[PDB]
RNA sequence: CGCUAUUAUUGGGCCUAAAGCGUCCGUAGCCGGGCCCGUAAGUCCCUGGCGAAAUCCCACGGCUCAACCGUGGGGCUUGCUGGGGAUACUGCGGGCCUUGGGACCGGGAGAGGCCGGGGGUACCCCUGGGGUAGGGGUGAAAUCCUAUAAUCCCAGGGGGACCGCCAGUGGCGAAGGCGCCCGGCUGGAACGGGUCCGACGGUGAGGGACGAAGGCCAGGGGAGCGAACCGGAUUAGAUACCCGGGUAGUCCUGGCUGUAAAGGAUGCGGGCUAGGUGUCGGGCGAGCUUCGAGCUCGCCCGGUGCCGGAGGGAAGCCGUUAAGCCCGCCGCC
RNA sequence: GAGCCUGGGCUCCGUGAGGGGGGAGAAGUCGUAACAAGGUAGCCGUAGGGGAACCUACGGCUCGAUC
């Protein structure tokens, strides 16, 4: 019927109250106990770096038909390994293994994998201190 | 003007004895047998609802 | 168990009672087998 | 009635609003109060005494013809009930039916009605506590209440 | 069960107004209501009320002449001092002279105008607009 | 952070989309009827002592204006404290009231519950008499019963479950749920009431009591039905639907388990916002009468249904038995 | 009263023969359980059975069509 409590000394019923209905939305629960930070192989950062090991092709979803390029990449901090899709008209060709390459987020909802390859959420963005965009373009080399 | 007052439907009579005459107040609407003051027979018998009076009316208050 | 009706509906799924009797066989089957 | 039941009953009287005793009445306060002492020492109760003077002898509204309700009228003499009424047929009601139930096992639906009995027992002894009709620590127990009645 | 008597009169108020009827009795008296329907006819939202004595309590016979487009009870009653009016007049009426707050003072039951003038607060208990 | 009235005091929602506990009784706590007297704790006004500076707002002035700096006036410092004054509201203290709730009397209603006794048909088995070849069963058939005399008819004996038509759109019960008759014990509701007490009330975290079927423990019993099982068919196959048999179980005593589309898929109390027409119980008033606890018509109260106007809603639909406007409490998303 | 050793409690992490189920993924095998009376109406609860969807029994619900 009508909202309770809502009498004029009901004050810690009311806390209560919101206290206890606001640990069903993720957005305060997943903040307050820190679970991104503690899942997370970038330890909370914008940029990681990390080596290259094996060079691959990903399947895109339907109803595409495509493959993508990636690359595994063993990271520096924490030794896990994640992988990174590699943007571009011929990227990967401008890639080797043991190269030292920079990691970002690829761009998606919360953080997450964006438009037709799932299971991706990384992103190239240096090749041994130098930047796919020129070494794509025709500025500048790999040394 | 409107039914705001809620007024009783129960009256007070005065009735006669027909044995010896006596006369006496009772209530229309009672509970427990009612009987003479004087030679102790029965005046009003009770019902669920108005009694069957078994005297005479003489006034209804 | 908490059910919630929704399962109960039809369409995409199996029928929920036969489920139901599918989650019991494998917890009596892991309940086992540690040795409780 | 509508404690634990939950119905919308209306079957009570409907008093006229009046400010002074009629004139058609015959006796007076001072033998209105010898009627009450009378009915008193036959046996009967408040409610029965009140019911009794309105039918038989013609007297509306004691507390018109007198300024003082029948239990004030008892507790100037020496009848004023030590346990009130309405506590103590309860009390009377719950005794009979653990009897009853004693005997009876598996009933099982009047037992409930023993249980709202006695709610209603402690509803009214927290009530008479506060106000000083029974000690600030009576308590109700059914072997010591069957001493009662 | 019955709480307040107050809010049950001016719900039957804004009824009965919008449905469209002249006389509204309102069974349960007290005194704020009878300084609150005051102030009313003062303001001119109401007509001619009279108190009818039954041996219950009193009764209270109202007339409604047609400029009432919503009334009702404020709780909680909020304290309220005399720096602090435009917020609930904006969050109870329409306009910045629109209705009446109605508020209980040390020295009687007036609209917060008066109150203002006389440069005290006091509690909130209804509206009328 | 905002967008987000997707955390909602302002300001959300729970028939069908996420969402009412299976239902009741109650502890703390929150909310609480009307008048009178008092106090002045909360609340309101006036004033004294404190809440560093920088930071924030405004005007003026100095570096070309500005950003910046300076003089002054205000706020911020979620507030603490010393006094004076007021008494509408709340709290505390003391008296009064009867409208809410409770108690009592009366005449009635009802498959409410427990105990004891007496019965009604039907079904199955057995024994006797009669009679001769098929009976049952299906879409069609076969497994099965039958010449050691079946099905069918008659006379007797025994046993276990159930209580047909009347029976209702009906009634009682917190819900689950409750239908043969008579007798005893017992719970609750409505109506009528110038009867008694005198606010004794609402909801209820935690806690408790009841709670279909099925299942378990221990003891008895065992007609019909019948999970499992076994057989015959149908089928590409048929671990099934159909047929013939059958174990636990269904029943009584004494205990555990505590679940369901436990559904009005609609939490409980209170006041308000058009009515119409049926039915159940009680009461009142008129007319009929075969003088019947009888028939018909109208009114008040309470229960239970069908329509429906304003009004509400995403709509289906609800609509004084709200899914509408108000005053409250608890559970949930 | 450090450090060292010893026992206990709480707690975090890595690993392990073998096994368990979950989620995705062009195209595979066996069936055909649900939506129409979906070809035995569907679904809740309890219990038993089956290669698998599933089938039966007891009690319920209509969110079930035809007369
Ligand atoms: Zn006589």
Redesign the interface.
């Known amino acids: 019927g009508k909202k309770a409590p809502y009498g004029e000394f009901a004050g810690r019923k009311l806390k209560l109250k919101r206290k206890k209905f606001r640990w069903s939305d993720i957005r305060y629960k997943r903040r307050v106990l820190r679970l991104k930070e503690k899942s997370d192989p970038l330890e909370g950062a914008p940029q990681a770096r990390g080596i290259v090991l094996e060079k691959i092709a990903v399947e895109a979803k339907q109803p595409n038909s495509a493959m993508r390029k990636a690359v595994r990449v063993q990271l520096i901090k924490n030794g896990k390994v994640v992988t990174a899709f590699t943007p571009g008209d011929g990227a990967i060709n401008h890639i080797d293994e043991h190269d030292e390459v920079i990691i970002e987020g690829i761009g998606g909802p919360k953080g997450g994998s964006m438009g037709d390859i799932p299971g991706i959420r990384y992103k190239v963005v240096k090749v041994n201190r130098v930047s796919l965009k020129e070494l794509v373009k025709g500025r500048k080399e790999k040394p | 003007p ?1 039914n ?6 129960s009256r ?1 009579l005065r009735v006669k004895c027909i044995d010896c005459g006596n006369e ?4 229309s609407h ?3 047998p ?2 003479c ?1 004087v030679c102790g027979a029965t005046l ?1 018998e009770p019902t669920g609802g108005k009694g069957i009076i078994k005297a005479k009316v003489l006034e209804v ?1 | 168990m908490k059910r919630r009706p929704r399962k109960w509906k039809k369409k995409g799924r199996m029928r929920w009672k036969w489920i139901k009797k599918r989650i019991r066989r494998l917890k009596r089957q892991r309940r086992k087998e540690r040795g409780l | 009635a509508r404690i634990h039941a939950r119905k919308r009953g209306k079957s009570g009287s409907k008093r006229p609003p009046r400010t002074a005793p009629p004139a058609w009445v015959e006796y007076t306060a001072e033998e209105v109060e010898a009627l009450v002492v009378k009915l008193r020492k036959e046996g009967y109760s408040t409610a029965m005494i009140g019911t009794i003077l309105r039918d038989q002898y013609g007297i509306p509204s004691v507390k018109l013809i007198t300024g003082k309700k029948i239990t004030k009228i008892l507790e100037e003499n020496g009848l004023a009930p030590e346990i009130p009424e309405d506590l103590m047929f309860l009390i009377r009601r719950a005794v009979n039916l653990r009897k009853h139930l004693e005997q009876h096992p598996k009933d099982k639906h009047s037992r409930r009605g023993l249980q709202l009995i006695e709610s209603k027992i402690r509803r009214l002894v927290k009530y008479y506590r506060r106000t000083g009709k029974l000690p600030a620590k009576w308590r109700y127990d059914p072997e010591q209440a069957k001493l009662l009645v | 069960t019955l709480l307040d008597p107050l809010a049950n009169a001016l719900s039957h108020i804004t009824n009965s107004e919008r449905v469209g009827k002249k006389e509204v009795y309102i069974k349960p008296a007290s005194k704020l209501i009878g300084e609150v329907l005051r102030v009313m006819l003062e303001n001119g939202y109401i007509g001619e009320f009279e108190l009818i004595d039954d041996g219950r309590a009193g009764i209270y016979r109202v007339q409604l002449i047609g400029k009432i487009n919503k009334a009702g009870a404020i709780k909680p009653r909020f304290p309220v001092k005399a720096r602090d009016y435009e917020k609930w007049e904006k969050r109870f009426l329409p306009a910045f002279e629109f209705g009446i707050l109605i508020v209980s003072t040390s020295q009687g039951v007036m609209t917060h105008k008066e109150a203002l003038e006389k440069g005290i607060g006091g509690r909130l208990i209804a509206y009328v607009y």
């Open positions: 409107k705001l007052i809620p007024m009783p439907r007070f006496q107040i009772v209530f009672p509970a427990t009612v009987r003051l009003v208050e």
